Design a protein around this ligand. Structure first.
Ligand SMILES: CC(=O)N[C@@H]1[C@@H](O)[C@H](O[C@@H]2O[C@H](CO)[C@@H](O[C@@H]3O[C@H](CO[C@H]4O[C@H](CO[C@H]5O[C@H](CO)[C@@H](O)[C@H](O)[C@@H]5O[C@H]5O[C@H](CO)[C@@H](O)[C@H](O)[C@@H]5O)[C@@H](O)[C@H](O)[C@@H]4O)[C@@H](O)[C@H](O[C@H]4O[C@H](CO)[C@@H](O)[C@H](O)[C@@H]4O)[C@@H]3O)[C@H](O)[C@H]2NC(C)=O)[C@@H](CO)O[C@H]1O
Ligand SMILES: CC(=O)N[C@@H]1[C@@H](O)[C@H](O[C@@H]2O[C@H](CO)[C@@H](O[C@@H]3O[C@H](CO[C@H]4O[C@H](CO[C@H]5O[C@H](CO)[C@@H](O)[C@H](O)[C@@H]5O[C@H]5O[C@H](CO)[C@@H](O)[C@H](O)[C@@H]5O)[C@@H](O)[C@H](O)[C@@H]4O)[C@@H](O)[C@H](O[C@H]4O[C@H](CO)[C@@H](O)[C@H](O)[C@@H]4O)[C@@H]3O)[C@H](O)[C@H]2NC(C)=O)[C@@H](CO)O[C@H]1O
Lengths: 128, 126, 101, 453, 43
């Protein structure tokens, strides 16, 4: 079973950067993109970007470019080599960035596209 | 005239029923790579024999065109002769009769053995 | 960009009834995705490719639509179905419809 | 007469869409290459002296290149084929050792970092009893600082094992044909304006595909077959930024590449039978690997893609070009093989533009590696032996794998960036013309005919 | 802290193991069942 586990909630001061981790397991980590999305109070969901774990290629929402950086680390455990961690760092925070941040992954069926997110991390609340 | 293998794809089922011996022709003859070759070489004879299997459990080992004794259930198509032989194409026609092809085959299976069990009785008395 | 407009904002119905929720996209021709978010819970994928149900989603959830007009239908409402529902196409999202008792 | 009877037909022209194991075809000159070098050319069947592709008149066929198999099959064949080649090739197990490295003999400006580390190390001997301190030259990318000595290690030592490719092998991409079994056809969209998905009016059956050589390369794809009329820009979902864009050129843009250093190779006896090919003295100047393209033609061809792009994003739109956002060296740079060594060419100079609604060349620098980790390797890696002498290759650019920025905001300024990552895109780029079908010849239909008694 | 009668079936074993590099070594410990080991022969 696919599992995405994020790092805990944090309080950040304006001007700070926050680095959120998403430990992904139960599937081959290199085979699926991870997206990040934020749910903002009174504004709804905002897609942040995606990362493809093989080369760590990335794409960032135009309106957030310059403030977001996504990276990943692949398991270094010889008997458990297929999981990995995705990281998203979000900088120059303001109170308007107070939101719940999710890492998400698509379904693995034949008609599953890139954006329907079947799997969700438990979310990370960031209060600025 | 000679079109080529599958050339009468978009031709009428009458005109396509001319060039049958061309599609029937190019159908047999024509270590990483070595294994690919082998399970392709068997696949082609398996797939080929499965058709001869049918023609043989019917009476149509002739073969190409072969008439039979099972009458056409109008429910299957119900279209007139002209509008399928001088009109429709086999690509098209296949999808209509597709819903009952295996049911149709069953009608054929019983009908052939019925012929044989009968013809023995003729040569028996005569 | 795609603008997704969901309606109604709030839908008030009883257990056992059928809810219909709407999502109108500013651009036609794309398929629609729906999510359920129960209060305080992680969002859950319900429908993708307009009408296909996601993993473990019961058949009383029915997605449909065409062009710019898309619908989520929830048959025989269960107590758990009262939640906020969001539509999505690519990176774009509706602002959500709340189904209340 | 009114009563109709079914009469069966054998040899009916009709097919069902399929998947099946195909097989390879190559030509006689590939075996004339000898030298025990080309991969799988030997087990591979030959081609046809007089190939024929029968055009099928009056028929249309719904192609989809983003939901094809024979590219997944090919991608796989290439990975396997390659991996079977390395079994005999020697293991560099003991080369994973604490190196003691310095810089190469040079007088460069402080700003210019040293990319050639002269490393000495205790290597093994033909006899278990002894050892041997011996030196070799390594690129900065093939080593990591381990920790007032300046000591390093081969970068693979913590990720994976290492196996030295046999120099008696070749990396040259030679044309492959994918031939079908019997009672299986391949259908070829002969329409010269096809985007890869939907009904194709001009179609032809054919046994084998064309000569598809396996150029494995990021950013720009090279030496491929090019479009007949327009620069076609193909994608699965263009509106969605998450999906890449496959640009297929109309005109070839020739790009010359080289390693200027006259490198030398010495052979070190691991023993017995095992033998490591070290990098010996650099004869002559210490220069920088690079590639040149005409600024004129790049201007011209980047103008063609823009004319095409505005058909999808509006006539009154700005379309500028930017360099990679960030990621692995495998994807942040134009990767390829050239003469037997692997290149990593900075594409910032190519993707650095802007386009409004209405005589030298481009020197672009490169890096070079020897221990490579292609196809998203995890447990195994491969040391590409030093290729003695000076190296230069000349190639055409056939396409691109571009990527658009999803920030959007309905701005008429959506920019593009070169991408890569998944290598199926490359075979997707050449196999868009093809589709595999299962032949079903047993037709049944009514004609006024009963069989005799 | 078991009664003398009850024999120890979990032996804590330390040993010079190999490293990623041929150059070095590493003393590291692991736990083994009594059946997976034999007394070799006041250590
Ligand atoms: C630049 C880049 O990134 N691209 C590379 C690319 O360089 C390369 O492919 C090369 O490209 C270059 C440039 O595009 C080519 O160079 C050009 O080539 C021609 C050469 O002309 C040819 O034939 C000439 C002979 O002329 C006549 O004579 C014949 C024999 O006597 C006869 O049959 C003919 O009729 C012909 O006409 C008349 O002339 C003769 C006398 O010669 C007369 O008696 C007859 O009666 C006729 O009147 C000969 O001159 C030449 O050698 C060649 O064979 C040249 O015209 C170009 O020269 C001009 O420009 C040069 C710089 O551009 C400049 O220095 C000169 O001063 C000239 O103005 C030019 O060289 C080239 O052929 C081609 N190279 C190769 C290797 O194929 C490829 C290769 O990898 O990659 C790209 O990426
Ligand atoms: C910038 C970028 O990213 N883009 C690159 C791009 O640079 C490149 O394509 C190039 O672009 C540049 C800029 O867009 C081009 O430069 C401009 O070119 C013209 C040059 O004018 C041309 O002809 C001039 C001669 O003028 C006359 O004379 C002829 C011969 O005598 C005659 O037939 C004509 O009638 C003509 O009219 C009159 O003038 C003569 C005297 O010259 C007179 O007696 C007659 O009676 C007429 O009155 C000549 O001047 C010039 O060499 C060229 O041949 C220039 O006008 C521009 O110069 C101006 O701007 C310069 C900087 O922008 C500035 O330095 C100057 O001071 C000027 O104000 C300018 O250079 C360029 O041609 C083109 N380059 C190439 C290589 O093709 C491509 C290439 O890869 O890629 C893009 O991505």
């Amino acid at each position: 079973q696919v599992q995405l586990v994020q790092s805990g909630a944090v309080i950040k001061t304006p001007g700070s950067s926050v680095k959120i981790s998403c430990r992904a397991s139960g599937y081959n980590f290199r085979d699926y993109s991870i997206h990040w999305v934020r749910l903002i109070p009174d504004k709804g969901f905002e897609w942040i970007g995606w990362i493809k774990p093989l080369w760590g290629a990335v794409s960032y929402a135009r309106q957030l470019q310059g403030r977001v950086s996504m990276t990943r680390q692949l398991s270094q455990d010889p008997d458990d080599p297929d999981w990995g961690v995705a990281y998203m760092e979000f900088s120059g925070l303001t109170p308007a960035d107070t939101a719940e941040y999710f890492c998400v992954r698509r379904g693995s069926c034949d008609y599953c596209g890139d954006f329907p997110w079947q799997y969700w991390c438990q979310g990370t609340v960031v209060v600025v | 005239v000679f079109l080529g293998f599958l050339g009468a794809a978009g031709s009428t089922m009458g005109a396509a029923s001319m060039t049958l011996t061309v599609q029937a022709r190019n159908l047999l003859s024509g270590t990483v790579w070595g294994i690919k070759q082998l399970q392709a070489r068997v696949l082609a004879v398996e797939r080929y024999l499965r058709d001869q299997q049918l023609l043989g459990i019917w009476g149509c080992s002739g073969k190409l065109i072969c008439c039979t004794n099972v009458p056409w259930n109008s429910s299957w198509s119900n279209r007139n002769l002209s509008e399928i032989w001088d009109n429709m194409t086999w690509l098209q026609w296949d999808k209509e009769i597709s819903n009952y092809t295996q049911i149709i085959y069953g009608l054929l299976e019983e009908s052939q053995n019925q012929q044989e069990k009968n013809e023995q009785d003729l040569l028996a008395l005569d | 960009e795609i603008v997704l407009t969901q309606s109604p904002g709030i839908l008030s119905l009883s257990p056992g009834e059928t809810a219909t929720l709407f999502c109108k996209a500013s651009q036609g021709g794309n398929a629609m995705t729906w999510y359920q978010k129960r209060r305080g819970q992680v969002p859950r994928l319900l429908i993708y490719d307009t009408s296909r149900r996601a993993s473990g989603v019961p058949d009383r959830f029915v997605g449909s639509g065409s062009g710019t007009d898309f619908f989520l239908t929830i048959n025989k409402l269960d107590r758990e179905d009262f939640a906020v529902y969001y539509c999505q196409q690519f990176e774009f999202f509706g602002l959500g419809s709340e189904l209340e008792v | 007469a009114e009563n109709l009877w079914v009469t069966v037909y054998y040899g009916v022209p009709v097919w069902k869409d399929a998947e099946t194991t195909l097989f390879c075809a190559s030509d006689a000159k590939a075996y004339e290459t000898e030298k025990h070098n080309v991969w799988a050319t030997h087990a591979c069947v030959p081609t046809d002296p007089n190939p024929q592709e029968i055009h099928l008149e009056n028929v249309t066929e719904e192609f989809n290149m983003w939901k094809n198999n024979m590219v997944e099959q090919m991608h796989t064949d290439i990975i396997s084929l390659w991996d079977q080649s390395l079994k005999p090739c020697v293991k560099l197990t003991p080369l994973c050792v604490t190196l003691q490295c310095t810089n190469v003999t040079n007088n460069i400006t402080d700003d210019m970092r040293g990319e050639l580390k002269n490393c000495s190390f205790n290597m093994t001997t033909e006899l278990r009893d002894k050892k041997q301190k011996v030196y070799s030259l390594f690129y900065r990318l093939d080593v990591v600082q381990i920790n007032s000595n300046k000591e390093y290690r081969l970068i693979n030592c913590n990720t994976s094992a290492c196996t030295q490719a046999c120099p008696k092998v070749s990396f040259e991409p030679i044309p492959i044909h994918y031939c079908a079994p019997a009672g299986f056809a391949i259908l070829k969209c002969k329409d010269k304006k096809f985007n890869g998905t939907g009904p194709c009016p001009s179609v032809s059956t054919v046994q084998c595909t064309h000569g598809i050589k396996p150029v494995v390369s990021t950013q720009l794809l090279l030496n491929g077959s090019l479009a007949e009329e327009e620069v076609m820009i193909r994608s699965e979902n263009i509106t969605n930024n998450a999906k890449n864009i496959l640009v297929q050129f109309n005109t070839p843009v020739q790009i010359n590449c080289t390693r200027p250093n006259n490198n030398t190779r010495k052979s070190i006896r691991i023993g017995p039978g095992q033998a490591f090919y070290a990098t010996g003295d650099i004869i002559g100047d210490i220069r920088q690997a690079h590639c040149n393209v005409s600024k004129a033609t790049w201007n011209e061809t980047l103008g063609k893609v823009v004319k095409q792009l505005r058909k999808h994003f509006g006539n009154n739109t700005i379309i500028r070009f930017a360099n990679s956002s960030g990621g692995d060296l495998e994807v942040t740079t134009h990767s390829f093989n050239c003469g037997g060594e692997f290149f990593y060419c900075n594409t910032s100079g190519l993707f650095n533009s802007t386009w409004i609604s209405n005589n030298d060349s481009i020197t672009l620098p490169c890096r070079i590696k020897q221990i490579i980790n292609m196809w998203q390797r995890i447990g195994q890696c491969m040391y590409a032996p030093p290729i003695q002498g000076v190296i230069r290759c000349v190639s055409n650019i056939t396409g691109l794998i571009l990527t658009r920025d999803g920030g959007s905001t309905n701005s008429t300024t959506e920019t593009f960036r070169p991408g890569g990552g998944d290598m199926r895109d490359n075979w997707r780029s050449e196999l868009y013309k093809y589709k595999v079908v299962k032949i079903e010849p047993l037709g049944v239909a009514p004609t006024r005919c009963k069989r005799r008694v």
